[PDB]
C-alpha cells in the first residue's frame, strides 16, 4: 500500500529523457557533479540549476548546503554539428565526510523566463551519489597531477571546466596580425 | 540579591549583595565568573584612593575559611606529587576531583567588606 | 610631519578624558546562513581638526585568550590593516570582523581588540621608519557575549541554536572506529 | 601585521592577516628551541598593481599588568614582489622539486599556510610503536635531520606535501598534529591511520593544548589561590594576637582576585575538555 | 505519508491564498570588514496545523 501510495504521489503532482546522465569527480576540498543534456532541453528558453540534497539519515543536524553552478559548452571536431551543454555543480567536501560518507541525491530544477504567468516549473531527479573514504583512499573519482595527465574520461575535463577560475578576455592588435598566440600556446606554454 | 550576613562583620552585616550564576558547562562559569571578577577588580580600586573601611570579625570564620583551605591545598600539593611520580590511570579520577574542589570554592568567592 | 607632530602632540599629551581621534569597540550580534555570529564594529572618530592625511595606516589585532599553551592554537590571533587615507575634521569609519565561532562554537573569553596607528614617512619620501600609536584596547569577557532571547522585546518565535552536540572531527572519530547546574556567586558590600 | 604602501594603493580595501607561533626544538637527542612568528594572507588581491612593498609590523604587549604599561612596536624589515620574481621561481614552492627541504624558511612557510590540527592519542593496556612504521613504511615519511621530531608525507598520490610531528609522551599517550592542504586530506589520513592502529587506540581533537597541561595549569593556579587564602587568614590571624582593617582584606582580596581570574581561565579549558 | 499528501494537495490547490506553508524574502543591507553586503533573510513560516516532520527539505 505504502508503495502504491506514493506512486499515487507521483502521478498526482504530474516520458522523454531530458538528461543523458550523472557523473561526479573530486577535485581537492571541491564536490563537482555534472550531467550531459539532450537536444530536447533548451537553454536558450530554460534557466536551470542544480541542487545537492543531504541525507538526514547520515545528517542528524542542519548545516546549511551551498552549490555553484555552471554550463559548459564545446564544440566537437569542428574542423548539424554537434554541441555537448553540460550542467554541473560544486561545493566543499569536508562537511560531507564527517560520517565517513554520505548519499546526495541530485536535483535539475528548469524554468521558462518568456511566459511571466510562472507557469512552468518543472524538475528531475538526476540520481543520487555514494561516496566513502574507502573510495577515494583508492582514487577513482580524483584528480592527482600528472600521472592524470592524458585525459580520456571527458568527465575529468568537464570536473577541471567546472572547479576553476574561469575569467574571459580580449586580445585585439590593431595594427598587426595576431598569430604567435599558437606558437606561445604550443612552443612557450606547451599545449595538448 | 541582597543577603545581611551578621558572623561575617562584628555589629553590622552591611546587606551585603550576591551575584549568583547557574549553568550546565562549567566552562561558561569560568567565563563568566572570570568577567565579573575582573569587573570588582576594576570597582575596588576605584574605589579605593576615595573609600574607607568597615571593621571584620577577625574570629571563627577566617580561621574557618584558613582551615577549609588549607586541607584542599595539602590534598592539591598530594595529588601533583602523584601526578609528577607517574604509577597508574595518570589523570582521571585526578581532574574529576579538581573540579569538585573548584565548584567548592566559587559559590563564595571574595564577600568585599 | 607637521600634522603628524600636531596630531601625535594632541592625543597623547593633555591627559584627558575627551581625545581628538577615537577607536571605539563595541560588540553585535548578526546572523548569517544558519549560525549566529559575533562582531566587532570599530568605529574611528576625528573630533579634532587635524586630518589624518596618507601614509597614516590603522593596526587592529583581535587577540585571543591569553596564557602559554605548550602545543599551539592554529591562530594565536589576527590582525587586520587599512590605510586611513584623507578622514577630515568629524569624519569617522565603521569596519564589522567577525570574532564569532571557530567552525564548533569555538570561542574562548577573555579576546581584547587593541587598535593602533601608524605614521611613516618611507611612504611619501623618506632620507629612520616610522610610528605606533596606541589607541582603545578593550576585552570581551562573557558578560558582553550572552543573549537573552526570552526576555527580548519581540517576543517572536526565534528557533533554539543548541550548539553542535559533537564536534566533526568528535563525530568523524566515533564513526570511524565502531546532572547539577555548576554555581558560582560572590557578597560585596552594599 | 603587515602594511600596504598608499603610493602603490591609491584605493582603499581591508587586509586580513593570520598569525601564528611555531615551537621547534634544535636536535633533543640549554637545548635551543626556535620560536618563529608568522602572518599569512591572500597575494591575489595585492597584484593588482603588477607589484607592491609591505611593511612587517611585530607589536609586543604585557599581559602580567592591568595597567597596559608597555606597548612596544617594532618595525622589523619591509617586502617588495612581482611577477617577474615569481615568474623565476625563487621564492614559490611547487611540489615534487622541492622535496629536499634545506632552506628552513620555506618548511615554515609551509608549516604557517596549511591546515593545522593537533591530536591525542592513548593506547591504555599496551605499548605503542605502529605509529613510527606507519609514518616510515606506509605513508613513507623522510624526518628532516635538522628538526628530527617533523615527518614529510612523499608518497605520491593525493598525501604529497603534507606534515606531521610525533612527541611519545609515556609511550602509551602520544601525541600527533597534522598540517595539510585542506581538511579532506585530515579526512582521508584519519581514516587510513585508524584502520592500521590497535583497537583501544582512543583519538581525541586537541584544540588548546594536551590534557596533562591543562591538569598543571588547573593545579598551578587554585594551588596559588588557596595559598593566597591561607595568607589572607594568617594575615588576620596575626592581626587577632596584637576588629581587621577592611584596607587590608581589600588589599587581600585583589591579590586573590588575580589568581582566581586565572583559575577561571584553567577551568573553562578544563571543563570543555 | 498522509500529512504529506494532504499537504501536497493543499499546495497545488489555488485557494487564493497560501495557507498551509509559506516563504517570505526580504532585502537587508549589512556591513563586513570594509564592503556593505546585500542579503537575503528567506523566512520560512508554518501557519496550518501541519508539522512537516523528517523526510522533508
Not at chain 1, 542528524?60 to 554541473?88: A, D, H, W, Y
Not at chain 2, 597508574?88 to 579520577?93: G, I, V
Not at chain 4, 621547534?24 to 607589484?51: D, G, H, Y
Not at chain 4, 587577632?240 to 582593617?245: D, F, G, P, R
Amino acid at each position: 500500500i505504502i508503495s502504491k501510495s506514493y506512486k499515487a504521489l507521483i502521478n498526482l503532482v504530474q516520458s522523454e529523457q531530458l538528461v543523458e546522465k550523472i557523473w561526479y569527480r573530486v577535485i581537492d576540498d571541491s564536490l563537482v557533479v555534472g550531467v550531459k543534456t539532450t537536444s530536447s532541453l533548451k537553454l536558450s528558453l530554460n534557466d536551470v540549476t542544480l541542487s545537492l540534497l543531504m541525507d538526514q539519515a547520515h545528517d542528524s543536524r542542519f548545516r546549511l548546503l551551498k552549490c555553484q553552478n555552471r554550463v559548459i559548452k564545446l564544440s566537437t571536431n569542428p574542423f548539424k554539428k554537434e554541441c555537448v551543454q553540460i550542467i554541473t555543480a560544486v561545493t566543499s567536501l569536508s562537511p560531507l565526510l564527517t560520517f565517513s560518507k554520505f548519499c546526495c541525491t541530485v536535483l535539475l530544477q528548469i524554468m521558462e523566463r518568456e511566459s511571466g504567468n510562472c507557469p512552468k516549473d518543472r524538475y528531475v531527479v538526476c540520481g543520487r551519489v555514494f561516496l566513502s573514504l574507502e573510495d577515494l583512499s583508492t582514487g577513482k573519482y580524483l584528480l592527482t597531477f600528472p600521472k592524470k595527465k592524458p585525459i580520456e574520461h571527458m568527465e575529468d575535463l568537464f570536473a577541471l571546466l567546472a572547479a576553476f577560475h574561469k575569467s574571459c578576455f580580449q586580445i585585439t592588435s590593431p595594427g598587426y596580425a595576431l598569430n604567435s598566440m599558437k606558437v606561445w600556446l604550443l612552443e612557450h606554454m606547451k599545449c595538448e | 540579591r541582597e543577603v545581611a550576613m551578621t558572623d561575617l562583620c562584628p555589629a553590622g552585616p552591611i546587606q551585603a549583595v550576591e551575584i549568583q550564576v547557574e549553568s550546565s558547562s562549567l566552562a561558561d562559569i569560568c567565563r563568566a565568573h572570570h568577567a565579573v571578577v575582573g569587573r570588582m577588580q576594576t570597582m575596588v580600586t576605584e574605589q579605593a584612593t576615595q573609600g574607607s573601611s568597615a571593621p571584620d570579625l577577625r574570629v571563627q570564620y577566617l580561621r574557618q575559611i584558613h582551615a577549609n583551605h588549607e586541607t584542599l591545598l595539602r590534598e592539591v600539593q598530594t595529588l601533583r606529587d602523584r601526578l609528577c611520580t607517574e604509577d597508574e590511570a595518570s589523570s582521571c579520577a585526578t581532574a574529576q576531583r579538581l573540579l569538585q574542589v573548584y565548584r567548592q570554592l566559587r559559590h563564595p568567592s571574595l564577600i568585599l567588606l | 610631519l607637521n600634522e603628524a607632530m600636531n596630531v601625535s602632540c594632541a592625543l597623547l599629551s593633555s591627559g584627558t578624558g575627551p581625545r581628538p581621534i577615537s577607536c571605539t569597540t563595541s560588540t553585535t550580534w548578526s546572523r548569517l546562513q544558519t549560525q549566529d555570529v559575533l562582531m566587532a564594529t570599530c568605529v574611528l572618530e576625528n573630533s579634532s581638526s587635524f586630518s589624518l592625511d596618507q601614509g597614516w595606516t590603522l593596526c587592529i589585532q583581535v587577540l585571543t585568550s591569553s596564557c602559554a599553551l605548550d602545543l599551539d592554537s592554529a591562530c594565536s590571533a589576527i590582525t587586520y590593516t587599512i590605510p586611513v587615507d584623507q578622514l577630515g575634521p568629524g569624519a569617522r569609519r565603521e569596519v564589522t570582523l567577525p570574532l564569532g565561532p571557530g567552525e564548533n562554537g569555538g570561542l574562548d573569553l577573555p579576546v581584547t581588540v587593541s587598535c593602533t596607528l601608524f605614521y611613516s614617512l618611507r611612504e611619501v619620501v623618506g632620507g629612520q621608519e616610522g610610528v605606533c600609536l596606541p589607541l582603545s584596547r578593550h576585552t570581551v569577557d562573557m558578560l558582553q557575549c550572552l543573549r537573552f532571547p526570552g526576555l527580548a522585546p519581540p517576543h517572536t518565535r526565534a528557533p533554539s541554536p543548541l550548539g553542535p552536540t559533537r564536534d566533526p572531527v568528535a563525530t568523524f572519530l566515533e564513526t570511524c572506529r565502531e546532572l547539577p547546574p555548576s554555581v558560582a556567586s560572590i557578597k560585596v558590600s552594599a | 601585521s603587515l602594511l600596504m604602501d598608499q603610493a602603490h594603493d591609491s584605493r582603499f580595501r581591508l587586509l586580513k592577516c593570520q598569525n601564528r607561533v611555531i615551537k621547534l626544538s634544535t636536535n633533543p637527542f640549554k637545548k635551543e628551541c626556535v620560536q618563529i612568528i608568522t602572518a599569512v594572507t591572500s597575494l591575489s588581491p595585492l597584484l593588482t598593481f603588477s607589484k607592491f612593498c609591505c611593511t612587517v609590523l611585530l607589536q609586543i604587549m604585557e599581559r602580567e599588568s592591568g595597567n597596559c604599561p608597555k606597548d612596544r612596536y617594532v618595525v622589523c624589515g619591509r617586502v617588495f614582489l612581482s611577477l617577474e620574481d615569481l615568474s623565476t621561481g625563487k621564492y614559490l614552492l611547487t611540489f615534487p622539486k622541492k622535496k629536499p627541504i634545506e632552506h628552513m624558511e620555506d618548511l615554515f612557510a609551509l608549516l604557517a599556510a596549511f591546515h593545522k590540527s593537533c591530536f591525542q592519542i592513548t593506547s591504555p593496556g599496551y605499548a605503542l610503536n605502529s605509529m613510527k612504521v606507519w609514518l616510515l613504511e606506509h605513508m613513507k615519511c623522510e624526518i628532516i635531520k635538522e628538526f628530527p621530531e617533523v615527518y614529510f608525507c612523499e608518497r605520491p598520490g593525493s598525501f604529497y606535501g603534507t606534515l606531521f610531528t610525533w612527541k611519545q609522551r609515556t609511550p602509551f599517550e602520544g601525541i600527533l598534529i597534522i598540517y595539510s592542504r585542506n581538511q579532506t586530506v585530515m579526512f582521508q589520513c584519519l581514516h587510513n591511520l585508524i584502520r592500521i592502529l590497535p583497537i583501544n587506540c582512543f583519538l581525541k581533537n586537541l584544540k588548546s593544548g594536551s590534557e596533562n597541561f591543562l591538569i598543571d595549569n588547573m593545579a598551578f593556579t587554585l594551588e596559588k589561590e588557596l595559598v593566597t587564602l591561607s595568607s589572607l587568614s594568617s594575615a588576620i590571624a596575626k592581626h587577632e594576637s596584637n576588629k581587621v582593617s577592611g584596607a587590608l582584606y581589600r588589599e587581600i582580596t585583589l591579590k586573590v582576585a588575580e589568581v582566581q581570574l586565572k583559575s577561571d581561565f584553567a577551568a573553562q579549558k578544563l571543563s570543555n575538555l
